[PDB]
Amino acid sequence: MAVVPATNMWVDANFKETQIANMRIGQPVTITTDIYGDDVKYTGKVVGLDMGTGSAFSLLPAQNATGNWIKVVQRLPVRIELDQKQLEQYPLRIGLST
Amino acid sequence: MAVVPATNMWVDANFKETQIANMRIGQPVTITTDIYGDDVKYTGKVVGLDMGTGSAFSLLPAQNATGNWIKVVQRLPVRIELDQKQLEQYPLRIGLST
Amino acid sequence: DMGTGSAFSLLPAQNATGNWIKVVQRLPVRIELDQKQLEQYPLRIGLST
Amino acid sequence: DMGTGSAFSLLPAQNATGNWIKVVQRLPVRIELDQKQLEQYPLRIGLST
Amino acid sequence: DMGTGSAFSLLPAQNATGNWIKVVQRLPVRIELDQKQLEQYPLRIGLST
Amino acid sequence: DMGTGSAFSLLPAQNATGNWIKVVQRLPVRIELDQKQLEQYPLRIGLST
Amino acid sequence: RHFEETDDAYVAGNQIQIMSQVSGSVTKVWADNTDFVKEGDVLVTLDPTD
Amino acid sequence: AQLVIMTIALSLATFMQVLDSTIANVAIPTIAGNLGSSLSQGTWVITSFGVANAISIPLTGWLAKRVGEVKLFLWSTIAFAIASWACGVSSSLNMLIFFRVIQGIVAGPLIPLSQSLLLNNYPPAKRSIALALWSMTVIVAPICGPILGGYISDNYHWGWIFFINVPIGVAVVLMTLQTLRGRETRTERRRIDAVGLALLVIGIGSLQIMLDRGKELDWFSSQEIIILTVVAVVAICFLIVWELTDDNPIVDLSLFKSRNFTIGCLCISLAYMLYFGAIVLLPQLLQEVYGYTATWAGLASAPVGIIPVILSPIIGRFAHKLDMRRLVTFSFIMYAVCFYWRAYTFEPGMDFGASAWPQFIQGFAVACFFMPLTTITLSGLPPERLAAASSLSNFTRTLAGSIGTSITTTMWTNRESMHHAQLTESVNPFNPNAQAMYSQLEGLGMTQQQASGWIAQQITNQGLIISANEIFWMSAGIFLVLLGLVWFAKPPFG
Q1: Quick one: which of D38, E18, H20, H147 has the most CB atoms within 10 Å?
Q2: Backbone breaks in chain D (C–N > 2.5 Å) follow which residues?
Q3: What per-residue string of b and e applies to C19-42 under the rule 16 or more CB within 10 Å gives b?
Q4: How far is the C-alpha of D34 from the C-alpha of H99, rounded, in Å?
Q5: Rounded to whole angstroms, how far apart are CA atoms G7 and D23?
Q6: Quick check: helix, strand or coil at residue E26?
Q7: Closest partner residue to F45 among A53, A61, A65, by Cβ?
Q8: Which residues contact B73 (CB under 8 A, 6 or more apart)?
């Protein structure tokens, strides 16, 4: 089975390569969810950016060998840490959009 | 071989993330199945809500990947419980829709 | 049977593209045959009926 | 052969899926080819006929 | 070679399906090359010809 | 490199299948970057240039 | 602009796949889906015959 | 009565061409296989007809002014029957290409000449009814084709696709001779312009070749496509400059001086671009991503003809009390509704009914788009020029259809590639519910490489569905803007 602790949760924000620049550690963030709508806000901070784009560790070709090659803008995940006093009263769940 | 008991059964709801803000544990619920029509109404109770939507537990998670022209909304299964006195009178089977 | 076709699938129906639409489900029923007539007209696995 | 191609496959085609449409079924049949003529006209595996 | 490619493939070809359509088969052939020519204009695996 | 991406892919390309459409191939090439300017302007794995 | 936005975000967390340190057969199961379990609680029990 | 028999005959004349156009594209795989050729090699059997027909359609009026409309109709019908027979009994791919070229060159004067004859012969008291009846045959044949084409492909030897046209031509010629006797058209001899013909041939042929071959050559990354587009653009520019200055009209461009004609042509051409670029995907999507057969795939588009086959007379009967513009607007809104319907409802496990209701809805949209817009297009022009106007309208419409197909196919494949790239990322180590899939696969005995291929195939299918639904959304959005253009046309309708 699985046990899912509901205390320490973060957010993974996928930004394009165009936006990754100008993002440093510790910058303020504001996160709004859909289950709670706009009636509740969240505060957080940048923890850091990842040294990989997801496609680094993929086990399969990104595109088919038979087909041609088409340019696709890449995305790079960013770790954002939430404040824990808001989760206890407005809890979240894994995989919700924001 | 697989042995499948016919005594205790529940229902997985798969609600939209945008309509679960106000559900609680123990709220009443009524269920009508497409096998017995609209003349056999079950009654149940909300045991609890799951953590992890439906995309989080899948190999190919539908997501708002950058470049997508159509936005998507996730779903989060919630669990219901059936009154067994009704169930023994009108047996159900796994996978039936309601 | 005690489950529909999708419930007891071999591999999970892979995650949809983001849309979901209700479709009717189907449940198998095991029908016996008269053996005395199979010998006159044999069948084979996978023939539609 | 005692079984259709849709069955007897690596993954037996799963009916009862709620999106089922009827299609004809094909049953393989084995044919022995005169061996005195293969030597004059060799054949290969997978050549259509 | 002794197979038409579709017979000798990573995933075996299924032809007793029902949605089968006829397509031309292909058969690989082995060609030698003069090594002296390759000495001054080298090739690499996968280049088309 | 001594091979095309399609030839040396984790999944081979199967050209002897009849439903084959010609496509220009590509060959990987390695380029050495200077490390002195990497400190000033870091780069991540997977970015595009 | 001074801001950067993205709708490709998703909440994330930790998950542990409970696994046994030994082989055997099961005789009890102490929890089901949507059950609160504390650290140090028994979740499964095996036959101690072997 | 003679009027009804003539109507049937001309309906058949305009029906045979649509049947022949639609059936071949469905039958191309088996035909290509039976003659020892590949799909790319065989698809030339369609491009040749496309080029020939594209050249032939603009030239209808020039031959009409000299040979005579009735004689041209009869001769073209007999020649088309003969060409279809010859194609049916072919025995090689090259011979098939030759006879298809001949057939396409012959068949050009069918649709516009038939429309002109029907419009003129009927008394003005029932012009609207004649036009309404005509629009039906162009809306029903495209669906009546693929079902029979698939049945013939999967049951009998090919060649019977091109044999059915023989009896249709025979009936058409017999009825036309028996009914049109004495209703001849006045003729006139005039000098021939050579530069106009040469420029038209070169330019339109180059455009058709470019459109039909761009995909496989990755469009502008091939020098051949570049030279083709250059020659096409230069030829068209010079021809357009010349024709407005030419004394003898190889192409009658004076019709563009009418505001109604310009607006109607533009609206019909753009709407047809969207329509025909959209419908093309559905058969391929069903056959490849869902496992449908050709006959089943064609059967999924039957519910489109349920509505028009009823409402067409009613619209024709009551045309006296309708501001046709409001019908065009309603049809555009109904086309947006249908495409948005498809956009938010396509799923991997969708039954036959999930792709049959939207076409039932699209029936209304198609029903109220051809007759009103064509009535506006040919509004107020004198009876003698109806031939040239029809030729121009058909030429523009066919160009729009080809352009739509060319754009849509490339968008579909490219967006599929993008989605494939964005999906395969999740399949890596360090991921539960990713090693579990491998474990279950190896449970069934598949190797590691085979399991990887299977996962890749599934990702491909999902990407195709997503990319296909992204195109439908774009088409509906584009429709929403094309709505208001139809209001620029004055009301001289009559």
Answers
A1: H20
A2: none
A3: beeebebbbeeeeeeeeeeeeeee
A4: 41
A5: 44
A6: coil
A7: A53
A8: A34, A97, B16, B17, B18
* Residue H144 token pair: 């009546």
Q: Can you name the residues that pair with A42 across neighbouring β-strands?
A: A31
The structure's method of determination equals: cryo-EM
Strand partners, B28: B45
Amino acid letter, residue D31: I
Q: How many helices (H) and strands (E) does chain H have?
A: 20, 0
Using CA atoms of E32, E37, E40, E41 in order, give the dihedral in degrees to the nearest 10: -60
Count CB atoms within 10 A of the CB of residue H236: 17
Q: How far apart are CA H108 and CA H80, in angstroms?
A: 10
Q: List the chains bordering chain D where 3 or more Cβ pairs fall under 8 Å.
A: C, E, H
Extract the tokens encoding H254.
């004076």
Which of C:1-49 have CB within 8 Å of B? 1-8, 14-18, 20, 22, 24-25, 27
Q: Which residues touch C34 (CB under 8 Å, ≥6 apart)?
A: none
Q: Residue for token digits 């496959």?
A: D9
Q: Which two tokens stand for residue D20?
A: 């089922």
Please tell me the distance from the alpha carbon of residue H406 to that of residue H21, in angstroms, as a whole number: 17
3 state SS of A43 = strand
CB atoms near residue B29 (< 10 Å): 16
| Chain CA centroid to CA D13, Å | 15
Q: Round to whole Å and give the CA distance between C3 and B92.
A: 9
Distance CA H469, CA H412 (A): 9
Alpha helices in H425-494 (DSSP H): 435-443, 448-482
Residues of H in contact with B59 (CB under 8 A): 426-427, 433-434, 437, 455
**C-alpha span between H253 and H389 (Å, rounded):** 9
Token reading at H180: 């049109």
Torsion sign, CA atoms H243, H245, H248, H249: positive
Closest to C17 (Cβ–Cβ): which among H440, H444, H469?
Answer: H469
How far, rounded to the nearest angstrom, does the alpha carbon of residue H388 sit from its chain's CA centroid?
Answer: 20
* d(C-alpha A63, C-alpha B12), whole Å: 36
Token pair, residue H75, equals 């001769």
Task: Quote the CA–CA distance of D21 and D13 in Å, as a whole number.
Answer: 12
**Pairwise CA distance, residues H90 & A81, whole Å:** 72
- DSSP one-letter string for G22-44: S---EEEE---SS----TT---E
Rounded to whole angstroms, the Cα distance separating D19 from H346 reads: 13
Q: Which residues contact F30 (CB under 8 A, 6 or more apart)?
A: F1
Helix pair angle (H386-424, H448-482), 10° resolution: 140
DSSP class of residue H191 equals P
| Neighbouring subunits of F (3+ Cβ pairs under 8 A) | A, E, H
Q: B26: alpha, beta or left, given left = phi > 0 and alpha = psi -120 to 50?
A: left
Long-range contacts of H244-253 (CB under 8 A, 24+ apart): H246/H193, H246/H196, H248/H190, H248/H191, H248/H192, H248/H193, H250/H62, H250/H193, H250/H196, H250/H197, H250/H200, H251/H58, H251/H61, H251/H196, H251/H200, H251/H392, H252/H61, H252/H385, H252/H388, H252/H392
Q: How far apart are CA H84 and CA H136, in angstroms?
A: 24
Q: Please, are residues F27 and E44 in contact by the beta-carbon 8 Å criterion?
A: yes
Burial H194-227 (b: 16+ CB within 10 A, else e): eebeebbebbbbbbbbbbbbbbebeeeeeeebee
Helix (H, G, I), strand (E, B) or coil at H404: helix
Rounded CA separation H25/H279 (Å): 13
DSSP state of B59: S
- How many CB atoms neighbour CB F18 within 10 A? 17
Structure tokens at B97: 């829709």
Packing angle between helix H324-343 and helix H259-279, nearest 10 degrees?
20
- How many angstroms separate the first and last alpha carbons of chain F? 19
Q: Cβ–Cβ of A73/B66 closer than 8 Å?
A: yes
Counting DSSP H helices and E strands in chain G, the numbers are 0, 4
- The CA distance from H452 to F9, in Å, is 12
